[PDB]
Swiss-Prot record, chain E:
LRR repeats: from-to residues: 30-51, 54-75, 78-92
Taxon lineage: Eukaryota, Metazoa, Chordata, Craniata, Vertebrata
Complex and partners: Interacts with KCNMA1.
Record's comment describing the protein's domains: The transmembrane domain is necessary for interaction with KCNMA1.
Protein name: Leucine-rich repeat-containing protein 26
Organism name: Homo sapiens
Disulfide feature: C1-C7, C5-C15
Span of domain LRRNT: 1-29
Cellular compartments annotated: Cell membrane; Cytoplasm, Cytoskeleton
Gene name linked to the record: LRRC26
Length: 226, 237, 97, 49, 92
């Protein structure tokens, strides 16, 4: 379909290692499973993939993306594979993944996201797995993990975490099922004080700490009358 | 092991203070309405009144203790303002909180004695000293109970500096008109300056409640004091 | 005092939110009415923070003409209002037998 | 009042649009006469934006 | 041995010109003499070397790091060589 990339026998698909600071033109329904590697796509316009009726795999590898529109993915409709790793996104625009209801797979590896909005992520009920490898984010909101019902595996290798309340949900998620597949996958939790050091694998799941109960009624009765 | 702060809850202390104030006000009003058309006490009242003023040696001791402990409470507020606005601190480790416990216990006893000595209970309830007693001690008790600390309306401790002129007059230290006026002006000015600075610090270190506390500005208490001083003099750097 | 404060704030809001006629309304500065109220309050007291201020010729002209007189109004009104509020007689109660 | 205001504004205009002689007239500020009038009005009322 | 890089029998040496911004996964104590070439990452991630317990040298070829983290160098400690050549470091 793209003039620059030779048409793939069978179902039309994009070419790898394409050298093209310009987006592939001539998109259509026959074009499926776009592959972009080492390209220079600064931004995604709204309705970027409207021409392609349905797509299976989207892979944005080594592409410098610094601004994604809220409705840039209006056209996808029923996308299954999409990996968002090693990208330059500062933050996800709200409602970006709302059309991505059928997105089975998504991974976030090496994204310099300061914090990702749970509203931007959306429900994504049919999510097989996710990753958080080498991401600049250090605090994960409990809502982000609570929104996804069917999430199974989360990769945290290469991204040490800060011990505190922000760790309480994640380890609780670890309490549901073990995230480290191998002993070499374990990572340590960083502390504000340099004197103390601890690995997250040695960190007890749902371990008691300060502010263990966010709210209660027994103490609510007495703080209303003390 | 010296962890950080996470979930943010502050309605406990403020709610306790508002209950302690408004419930008492409503009880006083209800008693007055019931007395209206039926819709030894003097001895203890006089004893409490003699205790409040420096009439007896124990009265002078109590007055001097009130002065010193109000100053100490203001200093403790400064030290706590150096800390984060919302933190978790166990009672048995930090020595600041036991000292604050003793100070607040003394202030609560002093308020009870003053209420016993008061002539009109309703007008005593709506007093600056009584108000700053309402909004300071119950928060401290709630904080020590919950093992967590919030820098709430603790700047109101500075408002305890207004009574310094009356405290000195009781001790027969101020007798002339010029010295009395000077002490009154100085105490009022310092108290309002420090209270405004503390309120600005509390409102700025936290954000707007409707903005999800995302408007926070990192202002030290000294910086807020400097800001208030610059604003009061119409300089406005 | 309140009426003139609100009227000046409203005029500043109208002038700043819609740019100069000779600039084809391209010089506009998005200002909430509350921000203009804060600006007028700051100016009337001769504080002049400079965090918020008028930028569009007409706005600066109105600020000049308002400085010529609203400042004197504030100076001669606010202490007077404060004095008219504190005029109370302290020993107004009755002895309790 | 008007004469003092206008003359001070004119002096500020002349000084700012031109530079400082020991600086080879390089330290200049492109100020309009209206901007100078506004600056003198702000200064004279102790506002100082 | 790195997953993408070839496993050299005997003494392990990382493949040259890996062209990977992130550190290779699967670092182990048997792995030694890591060679990171053409790292596009602006900053070194903390605990990046925690996979490999001990090394002997560390070389960076055409790698630009604007900042580093203390936890990044924790996993090291047995090294006797460290090379940060043509990096963009400004503060330590």
């Amino acid at each position: 379909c793209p003039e620059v990339c030779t048409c793939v026998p069978g179902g039309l698909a994009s070419c790898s290692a394409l050298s093209l600071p310009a987006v592939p033109p001539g998109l259509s329904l026959r074009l499926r499973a776009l592959l972009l590697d080492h390209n220079r796509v600064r931004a995604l316009p709204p309705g970027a993939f409207a021409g392609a009726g349905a797509l299976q795999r989207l892979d944005l590898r080594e592409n410098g993306l610094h601004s994604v529109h809220v409705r840039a993915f209006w056209g996808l409709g029923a996308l299954q594979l999409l990996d968002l790793s090693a990208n330059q996104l500062e933050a996800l625009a709200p409602g970006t993944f709302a059309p991505l209801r059928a997105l089975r797979n998504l991974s976030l590896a090496g994204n310099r996201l300061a914090r990702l909005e749970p509203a931007a992520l959306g429900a994504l009920p049919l999510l097989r797995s996710l990753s958080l490898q080498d991401n600049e984010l250090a605090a994960l909101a409990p809502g982000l993990l609570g929104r996804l019902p069917a999430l199974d595996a989360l990769h945290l290798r290469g991204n040490p975490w800060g011990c505190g309340c922000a760790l309480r949900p994640l380890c609780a998620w670890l309490r549901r099922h073990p995230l480290p597949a191998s002993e070499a996958e374990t990572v340590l939790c960083v502390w504000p004080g340099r004197l103390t050091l601890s690995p997250l694998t040695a960190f007890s799941d749902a371990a008691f700490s300060h502010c263990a109960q966010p709210l209660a009624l027994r103490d609510l009765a007495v703080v209303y009358t003390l | 092991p010296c962890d950080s702060r996470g979930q943010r809850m502050w309605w406990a202390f403020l709610a306790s203070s508002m209950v302690t104030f408004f419930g008492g006000l409503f009880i006083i009003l209800l008693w007055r309405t019931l007395k209206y058309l039926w819709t030894w006490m003097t001895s203890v009242k006089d004893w409490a009144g003699v205790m409040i003023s420096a009439q007896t040696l124990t009265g002078r001791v109590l007055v001097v203790l009130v002065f010193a402990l109000s100053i100490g409470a203001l200093v403790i507020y400064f030290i706590d303002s150096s800390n984060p606005i919302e933190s978790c601190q166990n009672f048995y480790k930090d020595f600041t909180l036991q000292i604050d416990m003793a100070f607040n216990v003394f202030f609560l006893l002093y308020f009870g004695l003053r209420f016993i000595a008061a002539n009109d209970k309703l007008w005593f309830w709506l007093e600056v000293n009584s108000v700053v007693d309402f909004f300071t001690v119950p928060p401290v008790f709630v904080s020590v109970y919950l093992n967590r600390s919030w820098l709430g309306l603790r700047f109101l401790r500075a408002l305890r500096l207004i009574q310094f002129s009356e405290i000195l007059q009781f001790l027969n230290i101020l007798k002339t008109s010029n010295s009395i006026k000077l002490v009154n002006l100085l105490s009022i000015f310092i108290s309002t300056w420090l209270t405004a600075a503390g309120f600005i610090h509390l409102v700025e270190n936290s954000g707007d409640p409707w903005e999800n506390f995302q408007n926070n500005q990192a202002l030290t208490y000294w910086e807020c004091v400097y800001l208030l001083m610059v604003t009061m003099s119409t300089v406005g750097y | 005092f309140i009426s003139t404060w609100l009227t000046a704030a409203g005029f500043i809001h109208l002038v700043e939110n819609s740019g100069d006629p000779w600039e084809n309304f391209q010089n506009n500065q998005a200002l909430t009415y509350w921000e203009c109220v804060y600006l007028l309050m700051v100016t009337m007291s001769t504080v002049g923070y400079g965090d918020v201020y008028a930028k569009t010729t007409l706005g600066r002209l109105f600020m000049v003409f308002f400085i010529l007189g609203g400042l004197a109004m504030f100076a001669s009104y606010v202490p007077e209002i404060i004095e008219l509020i504190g005029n109370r007689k302290k020993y107004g109660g009755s002895y309790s037998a």
